[PDB]
Amino acid sequence: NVDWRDEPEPSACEQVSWFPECTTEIPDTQEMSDWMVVGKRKMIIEDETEFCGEELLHSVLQCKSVFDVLDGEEMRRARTRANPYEMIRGVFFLNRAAMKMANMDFVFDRMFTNPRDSYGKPLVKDREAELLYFADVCAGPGGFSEYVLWRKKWHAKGFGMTLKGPNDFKLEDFYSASSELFEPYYGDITRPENISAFRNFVLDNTDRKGVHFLMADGGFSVEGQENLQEILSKQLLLCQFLMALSIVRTGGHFICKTFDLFTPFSVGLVYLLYCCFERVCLFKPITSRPANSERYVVCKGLKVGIDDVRDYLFAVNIKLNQLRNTDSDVNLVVPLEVIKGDHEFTDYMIRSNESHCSLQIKALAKIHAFVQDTTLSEPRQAEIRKECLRLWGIPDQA
């Protein structure tokens, strides 16, 4: 009962929708002192409708479950044929995540590779021999980094922290290999002492300022429960937000991969970033698969005076470690009354969640149709690859 053919022409052109400007004051310790609420540990996605229509949520949940019955190889072939952006995904870089950063660096006015001061002037010229400093926190640190170092070469310096094991870095490209351009820190991001350690390492190597921007992956995949990833990844997402506030310099930026944002815990986390940055937006680039839940929290311009929020999240993480492996969990980090009190923030959140669900439903329907009719094709895949490379300034090579 879905019409996937009523969809706009696939394009290299992408539109960004930002949250409205926050005009409320950064919360302080006393204001947040009753904000963390502990409750029963819950994994029921179907009734997380504070920021999404119930009917729409159930529809998307329904499509995903039907779609998951499907055999993997068959569905993967169809999804390759159905995705208009399939052909950009693999090109040029050694790591697919590098093309995602390429995509998003372009979309956000090079704010990552060419950050600006308040007068709009470049902070980092090649001449000045001053470095672009960045951090990459993920299961295999190097993919996001591969793009940055390709673009800025020796004018950049990156710090890596791995989410998996000590040697799970991606130091294979000609630049990530040089410890002068990229320094892995020698693996549990949930341990407070590891957070502090990495924070100090980064502060000591950036003149106590912090990095110009942090690139993070705040979610992990699980087979057989796409719906549940938002909940399973909640502590990782908090720790990445906490890392942003710990190592990004004033006026700096933050980009974080996440999944669905239906839960008040997730939305509370976003609300906090929205309080701490000049501009925040939720964005799904064309280089991420249209049928999945992946999106990016993109934060522009860390404000002054965020230490209370940083300290607050640090306390929440400790509480999460305490509640781990018990029937209790932290269910809120900001009260609903506060989040819903900000009407413009809430309107954006609902519009973002619902738009994502509506598009995801169509993308899943399309794949199903491509499974049933293997002659269906997406003819402009090649033209779109070409236009994207040109637009984003990426060589048409390997």
UniProtKB/Swiss-Prot annotation:
Induction description: By interferons alpha and beta, and by Vaccinia virus infection.
Active site positions: 100, 217, 257
Effect seen on changing residue 217 to A: Abolishes catalytic activity
Domain RrmJ-type SAM-dependent 2'-O-MTase: 92-303
Coiled-coil annotated residue ranges, if any: none
Compartments in which it is found: Nucleus
Binding residue positions for S-adenosyl-L-methionine: 95, 138-144, 188-189
Annotated substrate binding sites: 64-68, 79, 227-229, 292
Domain of life: Eukaryota
Effect of residue 64 to A: Reduces both mRNA cap binding and catalytic activity of the enzyme
Known role: S-adenosyl-L-methionine-dependent methyltransferase that mediates mRNA cap1 2'-O-ribose methylation to the 5'-cap structure of mRNAs. Methylates the ribose of the first nucleotide of a m(7)GpppG-capped mRNA and small nuclear RNA (snRNA) to produce m(7)GpppRm (cap1). Displays a preference for cap0 transcripts. Cap1 modification is linked to higher levels of translation. May be involved in the interferon response pathway.
Binding partners and assembly: Interacts with POLR2A (via C-terminus).
Name of the protein this chain belongs to: Cap-specific mRNA (nucleoside-2'-O-)-methyltransferase 1
UniProt lineage: Eukaryota, Metazoa, Chordata, Craniata, Vertebrata
Residues of the full protein shown: 140 to 545 of 835
